[PDB]
């Protein structure tokens, strides 16, 4: 009924970013976020994934005018999605909440408020650093975003600090990624060798049956 | 003490097959299997891995003479290792017991007794087919060994049957192996792309610090 016709509208807006047709991506999330709100309430867990993407789109859509108008709403939405995500004890529910703070600080940057950006980016880095690997790509992406906000607020000692931490993750990641390429191409070699030898003993088995059924006829 | 000086002798005999110097590989397992027997008994679980390799070597060593003598003992040993393995409820302990029956039937083949070979190979196939994948390489290797014994006993209908089953596994395996090469080289591509893009944003971050510390000096 509702959940059905709404889950349908979510798949659209995401492939509207795939399409890049943002203005229709917004109206895709508009109605979807409206239904779940009118049905389940402004805070029920059902509306987290919805309020997030709807807020996310308004930020992208916003790129003094109606741009300042859309930021105000995009904030309110992501705040809700944050509140909706944070309260649930789930690694997935938390990283979503981290993602709320992330875009929450991106909206702060767009609105020239950098102190808040520093706060929301800090909030998001905090959460991610409980669940994710130290070499996770996201730690790098937030450290950088945070170091940008620090820089906009001309706290260069701390902006340099975050750029360092973001490089420290990016390097330590490519290390893992290289190690994973070795093991990937290494196992690809093991698998390929077995095939190239599995291939070369079916001849033996056929010339075993060739020579077997021939002995069955000869006995007759 | 004993377990220490014996576990040492096991590592030798295995790298004596790596060396291919079988006659010294036998005396490597001889003493090792003797110590654990004299300490723990002719059936204690400690002596399974030992009695197996010692039996395994005597079979290889045996390739009417002292060859017939070594087969008699190689049998007795692998029988024990079988008894020692089978009684333990462990996927690993069972596949070892399957391996006992396997070499147990190989010894039967070498001794011109094919009916027993058929039995011991059948015993081993039975066990493996509980734990292993249907595309496991071992199912193929036993089906073949069994079809050989069936052939030596000129039951060609059943020898052809086993060669078929062994081909059916070997083909269905290369299918998996091919599928695993795809995913291996596929993931190798994902990992390699991330590196080639992780590499190309450290420039951005350095020219972010370059441009950052320069603003710190300019303020001063």
CA distance B143 to A179: 38
Asked if CATH classification 1.25.40.10 holds for the domain at A1-113, the reply, yes or no, is yes
Of A156, A184, A194, the CB nearest to B188: A184
Q: Which of A158, A179, A180, A193 to mutate to test the interface with B (most CBs of B within 10 A)?
A: A180
Experimental technique of record: X-ray
Residues B191-204: b if buried by 16+ CB within 10 A, e if exposed: beebbeebeebbee
Q: Do B163 and A215 touch (CB under 8 A)?
A: no
CA distance A162 to B162: 66
Q: Which of A148, A169, A170, A205 to mutate to test the interface with B (most CBs of B within 10 A)?
A: A205
Q: Which of A141, A157, A174 to mutate to test the interface with B (most CBs of B within 10 A)?
A: A174
Q: What totals of helices (H) and strands (E) does chain A contain, helices first?
A: 9, 0
- Three-state SS string across B72-96, please? HHHHHHHHHHHHHHHCCCCHHHHHH
Q: Do B212 and A187 touch (CB under 8 A)?
A: no
- List the one residue out of B126, B121, B36 whose CA is nearest residue B77: B36
CA distance B139 to B154: 22
B85: which 2 tokens?
Answer: 């393995």
A65: which 2 tokens?
Answer: 């005018």
Of B159, B177, B191, the CB nearest to A184: B191
Partners of A218 on chain B (C-beta within 8 Å) are none
Q: What is the resolution of this structure in A?
A: 3.3
Classify the C-alpha dihedral A198-B102-B157-B161 as positive or negative: negative
Q: What DSSP line would sit under chain B, residue for residue?
A: -HHHHHHHHHHHHHHHHTTT-HHHHHHHHHHHHHHHHHHH-SSSGGGHHHHHHHHHHHHHHT---HHHHHHHHHHHHHHHHHHHHHTS--HHHHHHHHHHHHHHHHHHHHTT-HHHHHHHHHHHHHHHHHHS-TT-HHHHHHHHHHHHHHHHTT-HHHHHHHHHHHHHHHHHHHHHHHHHHHHHHHHHHHHHHHHHHHGGGHHHHHHHHHHHHHHHHHH-
CA distance B85 to B103: 14
The set of long-range contacts for A138-142, using a CB threshold of 8 Å and a minimum separation of 24, is A139/A166, A139/A169, A140/A166, A140/A169, A140/A170, A140/A173, A141/A166, A142/A98, A142/A102
CA distance B125 to A95: 49
DSSP letter at A136 equals: -
Burial, B121: exposed, middle or buried (Cβ in 10 Å; 0-12, 13-18, 19+)? buried
DSSP letter at A134 equals: T
Under CATH, what is the fold of the domain B1-111? 1.25.40
Partners of A184 on chain B (C-beta within 8 Å) are 184-185, 187-188, 191
CA distance B150 to B114: 7
CA distance A176 to A171: 9
CA distance A81 to A48: 5
Angle formed at CA B159 by CA B155 and CA B160, multiple of 5 degrees: 120
């Amino acid at each position: 009924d509702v959940d059905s016709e709404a889950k349908k509208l979510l798949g659209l807006g995401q492939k509207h970013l795939v399409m890049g047709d943002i203005p229709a991506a917004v109206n895709a999330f508009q109605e979807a976020a409206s239904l779940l709100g009118k049905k389940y309430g402004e805070t029920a867990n059902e509306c987290g994934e919805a309020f997030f993407f709807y807020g996310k789109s308004l930020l992208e859509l916003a790129r003094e005018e109606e741009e300042i108008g859309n930021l105000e709403l995009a904030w309110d939405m992501l705040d809700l999605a944050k509140i909706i995500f944070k309260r649930q004890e789930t690694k997935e529910a938390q990283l979503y909440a981290a993602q709320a703070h992330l875009k929450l600080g991106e909206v702060s940057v767009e609105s020239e408020n950098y102190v808040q950006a520093v706060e929301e980016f800090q909030s998001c880095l905090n959460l991610q650093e409980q669940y994710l690997e130290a070499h996770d790509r996201l730690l790098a992406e937030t450290h950088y975003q945070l170091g940008l906000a620090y820089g906009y607020n001309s706290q260069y000692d701390e902006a340099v600090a975050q750029f360092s931490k973001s490089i420290e993750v990016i390097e330590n990641r490519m290390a893992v990624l290289n190690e994973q390429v070795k093991e990937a191409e290494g196992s690809s070699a093991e698998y390929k060798k077995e095939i190239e030898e599995l291939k070369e003993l079916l001849p033996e088995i056929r010339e075993k049956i060739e020579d077997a059924k021939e002995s069955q006829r000869s006995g007759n």
